[PDB]
Amino acid sequence: GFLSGKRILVTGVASKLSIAYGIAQAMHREGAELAFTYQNDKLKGRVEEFAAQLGSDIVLQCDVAEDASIDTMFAELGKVWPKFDGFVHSIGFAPGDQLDGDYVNAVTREGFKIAHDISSYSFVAMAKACRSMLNPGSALLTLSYLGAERAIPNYNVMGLAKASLEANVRYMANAMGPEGVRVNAISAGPIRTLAASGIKDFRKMLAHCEAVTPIRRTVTIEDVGNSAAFLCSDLSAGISGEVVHVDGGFSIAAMNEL
């Protein structure tokens, strides 16, 4: 496959019905060798099963909250991979009280710090940590959402964090371009998940969105996986600092009985 020869670190895989698993799946399918990271210790199980199922012994704890942990992880990853071809940033978090109702009400300085540190700074922290491991022809990829560009109810401070992340993409692409690293983002449409299949608000939402998305369905983890794979392959050599919309056209339509 078109990723034959590539070693790609892949973050935030924690479930099969997920963007991050869909990415790993499609990247393995394209003949890429993979590594994975996991958060707390009580997750090494599932992640090791996922990795194994995608031909990988390389599973590694990491907590992007701490600079320490990122260097450790990369020193370790260094043992098996002395020099690789990029990673997939699928990390984003806001203290749960942030995503509840009125944003001015909900937001706090603390909610802001975490959301931005985790959802945006983590992306660059990991770039700083492996700069010199990264081969020419490398590619980095993160995940974003329409909430960066528009005010979406409840998404609250995540919108701001995502916007930061989207700018990070631009700046990272500009710093790391001169030594052959492309940096990009996918802005993904909503995706059906056990979680979203567990709230009438989300269920009726995803259904309504389906009606107004031009291709008349929500994108799939597979759809995202393919675009991701491409964006990390040498097929996307022309592309850097871009935020690709992978939402079936949703964002480019308006008043579709929207």
Binding site: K200, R203, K204, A207, A211
Partner: protein, 57 residues
């Protein structure tokens, strides 16, 4: 839970007269209704809260 008391089946208790799309106000809102009543019975109006779901199973 009587025949009227059981049939689960967004509306105010009093407003929900045993008398779904029109008056009672019970596109896809009416679909998850069957799915929910289908589970607890393991089997136009709000008439089926008595008619269809008592004789059948």
């Amino acid at each position: 839970s009587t025949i009227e008391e059981r049939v689960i089946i967004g509306v105010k208790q009093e407003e929900v007269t045993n008398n779904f799309v029109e008056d009672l106000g019970a596109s896809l809102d009416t679909v998850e209704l069957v799915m929910a009543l289908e589970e607890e019975f393991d089997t136009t109006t709000v008439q089926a809260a008595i008619d269809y779901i008592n004789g059948h199973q």
